[PDB]
Chain length 459, copies 4
Amino acid sequence: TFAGIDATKHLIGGQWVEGNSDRISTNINPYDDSVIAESKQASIADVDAAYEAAKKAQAEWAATPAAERSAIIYRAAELLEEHREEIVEWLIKESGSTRSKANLEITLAGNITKESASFPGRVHGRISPSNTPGKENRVYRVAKGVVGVISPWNFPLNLSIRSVAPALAVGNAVVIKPASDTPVTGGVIPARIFEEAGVPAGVISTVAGAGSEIGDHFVTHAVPKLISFTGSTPVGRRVGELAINGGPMKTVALELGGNAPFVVLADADIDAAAQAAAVGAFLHQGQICMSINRVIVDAAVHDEFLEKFVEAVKNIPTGDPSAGTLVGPVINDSQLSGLKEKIELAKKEGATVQVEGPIEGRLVHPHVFSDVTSDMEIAREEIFGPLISVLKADDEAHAAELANASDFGLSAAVWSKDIDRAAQFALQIDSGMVHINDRFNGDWAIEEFTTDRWIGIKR
Amino acid sequence: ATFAGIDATKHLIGGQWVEGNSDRISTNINPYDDSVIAESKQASIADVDAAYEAAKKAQAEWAATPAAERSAIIYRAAELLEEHREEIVEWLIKESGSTRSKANLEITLAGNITKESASFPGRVHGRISPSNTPGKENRVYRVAKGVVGVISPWNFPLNLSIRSVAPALAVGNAVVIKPASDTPVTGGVIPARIFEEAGVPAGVISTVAGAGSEIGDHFVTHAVPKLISFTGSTPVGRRVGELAINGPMKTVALELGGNAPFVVLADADIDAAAQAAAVGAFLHQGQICMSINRVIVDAAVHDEFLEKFVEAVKNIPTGDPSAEGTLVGPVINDSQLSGLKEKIELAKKEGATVQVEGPIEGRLVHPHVFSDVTSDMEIAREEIFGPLISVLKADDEAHAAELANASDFGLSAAVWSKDIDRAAQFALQIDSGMVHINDRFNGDWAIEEFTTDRWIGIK
Amino acid sequence: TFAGIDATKHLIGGQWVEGNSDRISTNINPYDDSVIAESKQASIADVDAAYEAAKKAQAEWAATPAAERSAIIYRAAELLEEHREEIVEWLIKESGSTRSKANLEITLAGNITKESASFPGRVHGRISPSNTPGKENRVYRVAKGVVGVISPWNFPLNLSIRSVAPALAVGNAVVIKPASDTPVTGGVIPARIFEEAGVPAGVISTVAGAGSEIGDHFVTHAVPKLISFTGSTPVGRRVGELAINGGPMKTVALELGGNAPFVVLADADIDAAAQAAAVGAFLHQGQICMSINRVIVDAAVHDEFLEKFVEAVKNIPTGDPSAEGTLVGPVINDSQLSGLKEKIELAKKEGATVQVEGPIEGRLVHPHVFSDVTSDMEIAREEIFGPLISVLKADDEAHAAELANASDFGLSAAVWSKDIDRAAQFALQIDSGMVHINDRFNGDWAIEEFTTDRWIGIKRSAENLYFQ
Amino acid sequence: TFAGIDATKHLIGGQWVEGNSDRISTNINPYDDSVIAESKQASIADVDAAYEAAKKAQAEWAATPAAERSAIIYRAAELLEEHREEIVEWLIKESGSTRSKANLEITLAGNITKESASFPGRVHGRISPSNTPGKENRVYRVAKGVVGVISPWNFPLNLSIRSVAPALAVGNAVVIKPASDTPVTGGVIPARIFEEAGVPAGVISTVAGAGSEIGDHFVTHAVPKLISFTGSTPVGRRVGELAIMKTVALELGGNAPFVVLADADIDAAAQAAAVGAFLHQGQICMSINRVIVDAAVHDEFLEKFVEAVKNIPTPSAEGTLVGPVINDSQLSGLKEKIELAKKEGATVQVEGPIEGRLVHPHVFSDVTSDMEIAREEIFGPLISVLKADDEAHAAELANASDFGLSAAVWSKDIDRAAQFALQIDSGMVHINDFNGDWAIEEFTTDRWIGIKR
């Protein structure tokens, strides 16, 4: 259960109901394998009801005055704190998250929701200039309509609120489809938080189900105007294809965390950078916008940084997430293999082990690898686990090439005392976000969940 | 074969007009009489690589060029559009089978877009956002995408290539054009040459014309372009979207002029609307921002409109495009002729009634109008690309709204109603980026589409 | 007293202190003449203290994270809503507001600040395009610095907050100089309420004194870089003039609600327009952006509208402010009283027709209506600030626009006409910032007003310009 | 005469006419005292006509299609370079500006009106959110109406077009009243060039009257919604006061600071102080009347700087960099300022002759903040070099003067430089070195129309 209803149901038509599918998925605590629950998953006829109920209820929502919608969204943020401990526990249980990680995730979901509540009072269309006598060009800024959000298992609550909150505050009706492993932290909870906040029936909905049964059908559907996806790149591609291959076509917003880079230039404060890289590599692992899985260091400070970086990660306790742990267990037994495979492959491709830990159950301990090249799989591919490569750049220009060598969407970080030069270097990296010496953009968000409707009026 | 002096069979690569390298020989045929215009050796995969490579090397300096400087060159190309008017008209008629008067409208259109584009350099700005962390400063820079790949259509080659080419170049992008194999000079050589003669540095503008499929895929699939602009058919746009997702992703902008509706409401000036529908359906076909392919009239005025409309379209001179009176020219090629032929047959087999028909000799398809059509019929739910019209009856106001949203794609739509205010509300009920009441390039939309925002946080 | 601090004190430096001038102020209830309180006023010295304190504290406040400044502003809205009953009683006792009018004022005050809480994260600067190779143009949007706010006796709470809240939220430090008749509702409550929400010491202040020794010096001081004024246009003009030739550099934002025209066109919903006119003229008078001082009606529907408007005005409860039904209370003071008595007579001795009029029992002026008036009668061209309304006859649609603009007060105007598309075109002819059709605080304009832009152009040589 | 038309007439109601004032003015070449021309001055009734006609012709011009307005404004930029040499002479002989300084002003003039030609398309309104059930909020952005522009004698062509072009493009009707000493460079030429460009009759006007007659009537007139003034801080003040019912925009040039921080490429910066002190004299945006330097590079800066100013040659010539002063009243002002400078203790680091109206460069040193030479607006080639004990002093010293549209700061640490720059209350600050979006705002007003459906 959660906040007053059993976390195994689905919020369809504003009614918490049981799934009509034949499949029954068993949610397993990644740490000790204890059954958390068993729910009758949803069928396509259920997704249909979800979407159709959203379409039918969306207009009245979009038409609700700015202040109202704002107040409700703001209420949701209050509720996030008011149910904090119950949410922390679920984060620990289902997501295999650490007590401290869960705490962060909730604060983060609350900042996004807090910003998002100002959105109503920020959506503006414009009155364009006319080129033909008697013509009035008005471009209204409206809600896209119905958004289908597909949340991941890494930061289930955080990365889902990242799109549910702005999408709802702006007038859209949303339908969440969480990852198989985290259906309540990535779907039931955020859904419930907004229902409890006042979001009208049909506006917020959640539908969980097996990939092979509803995955495709959720994207290819005719109701959603926008599909927001957060996950791994190969799955993003598939959702991307599906959105344009017989739908009709709908906009698809892909949040593909990949192999993010942490560049340390020659004039960087190796001390702070060491500390920082340790936080971004493990304490924030899973969070697509702050996580990093490879630090690129200049040759002139490489040996020093590597030294300090290793002595910093050896002190990262790996254990029972319920505890001072800072790195809990991996999510699936499928996710466990993959990591195992990458550790080996790095060793096999000639990488150098710098920090290795035991692997008990799904409790993978940190792993560091120096002497890594941009062509090694460990660096090219997406990791999503406590794996960490250290590549050497013998030139500042080479650092930029190393940083762009692997695909990654979200963020990139760089350390350098020369704020001005670093800022210039940052522009030399292909990322929409680059942070120097240490998020969520509201403007970028209101634009992603609204559409501009140009209405030409000839008098 | 020549244009503005230059050999028209060559390709502009690395700032140098050269002959293609593939063994494939393409013969350009006049659509109206089958006389050969030219015979150009096609561009090979290697040629596309050179174009993208050289373009990528010259882009930075072009992007570093002062705003006023870039805008002077964009304004010059607009003057050049006019100075070369006479000759572009001949090419438009000769290659794309355009009517002489249609050709003159297209050129006015093109030049009107690049003059508007001329003001873009001084309109591109970034933000300095507030921070939430002490001592942090957020600066989001608005820069060029880098290299932009432009695929243009055979319908309004000049005007639709320019629609992307001009703003992209204006904003700091370097661009490579891959025109439709039927209109390589009106869609590639002429646009490319106007900007070259206007002074955009070598390598910043290029055209590479090649035989479809493989070269087409390579062109979209390449690692250099960070944007692929496409205007054309939906099955092809679909394919471009696929390739952009599989086979190093890049944003893809698709301009698919599907089946645009022309909505006539009960209180509409039927005579005006009728004349307007005639203009949009036949004198503007091919221009996917002003054309319409189906009419939706309120029952209460369906018969009045139909008769008044049938009258109007029966007075449209079909025939040789060179003649100044003509308004309907030939269809671009035999294949397109086949689709038009079979679409007509099918409309009949589906239950449609012929209201206006004529003989089709050569590639000269006379205007056709069907009545008693339903939204499930393909004559009204699929792209048309030819002088074929459908008229659907709307027994209800809200019903008209349904039929208007019955098709897949749509750039614009139009509504007719004397009640200016109620019409504006109605228009909002249509899912189309553009809707014109009682009578089309968005500068802002073009800046956002051809630039990329870089958020850079500093501590 | 008000929420733990005695209303008689001034908030300087972050501390509620007693005044230092020798002049002693005596608060008087406009409905009965009670001594609400008596308190020593602030001297020219207390104004300097407040400004200097605000000046030094300003920067850290501006540097506070946006979300943090935002939470502080948001809570002020909550506290405003919390101390509702107390503020209500205070509005009625001092400003002479009505039970229900005071309650409306607080809602208004509340909405404004919850809207302002949104401001910190909305304030942004720009990176403009460059025309000279190697040059970067940044244009920062920052706080003005210190803002002095002069609040009026009409809607003291709502009109002070209208500028105090966005200014604070945006990073300014602000010193309030309330109207002499309403020092607590116009200064103490809003200051205290922001203090109890969390704004730092020195960032919010309230210096109250007799304009006689404080007024001019407040506007003239060298610290404030913006003066916000709300009141009569005469005083407003004096403020403006004083700001241009005193402390060389400081802008002024004058909010002068003079004679807002309420225009009823040929095709209006005369019955709805009638009730609305009634509302804007009495329940809302004092409220700068909502009230109306004159109504102009197309001749074709003039007499029809007049008959119905007079009816609704006739049945408007006038009396004791404390009562929950009253809609019109006493005038703030005798000076204003004698100003209205003078205006009613002047309208008469100019040939105007009385439609409605009542007794004037102890500062309690009953609603007064005058028809058959023309654009040059003082009653229809000067500002009123009282329950006196004048109806003018318009020959046609075009004459309506001309009658509407016969003022010099363009702050807001209302227009009634069933035809929306044309009424909107018509509204464009009126010389006001805002016009409302068939029945209002702009946040965007507010942030522009309390911030300043700083263009910083930086040229980089080859030396400190990399990867070029 | 200019570009055909009679240069002594006043464009009113679209027609160039002779003034109705019984006062005549003899426009005199500041350089040699020769009489360029004489003209019947404009009267109060003349002004009323120019404004009354402008008002009637405005609504039509604003409703003119955006791309149309933009082609007209653009044309004016072509006409400006077509009449280039003809205008160069007028600044040369009337404004007393050199040949290099005149040419520069024409390009700058061109740039402004060319940037301004893109304004019609960039003027957007807004459809704000609604808080009341079923209400729409439209915020139209319209032209103010009629704009009274008061240009000055320093850079009369550039500083008049600066207001005029943006205000016209946007759809306002403008009436220019130029400085008594420059009625054609600051009034006739700009008005005549927009006329040829295509601006309708009554949309552009120029009226040259006597300060004592027209001066006050031009500002307090009911018609103009905006008054754009450019000049000395004291006269800018009366204007604003007189204006208070319409809004006024004061471009008050005073004493712009040139701060040279301890790590400021003392050499290349000394080269720039020279340029911003003489080459860009009349330029209220590119000129500096004082240099604040940190003790460390103080003497280092001064030497190279003195040698810089000493090399500046001394109108109709090519080499010449500095020209004569506009009039006698101004001349006596500089001299008067030069003397009390010495009487205050300042060291005459540099001093040149005073042949006629031509004042040679003057540079003083060991100057402090409580001296009129660093406090008052100078309007002449008089430089003051103040020493700053540190950087904190530099901030104080920089903000000392009451008026400042722009400032300059040289450093090497671009980042710290930027930070320091924000500590100087000035609209503009340039580091080691015309805003359109702000001009668009200035010549338009936002009209909020709320509709309860």
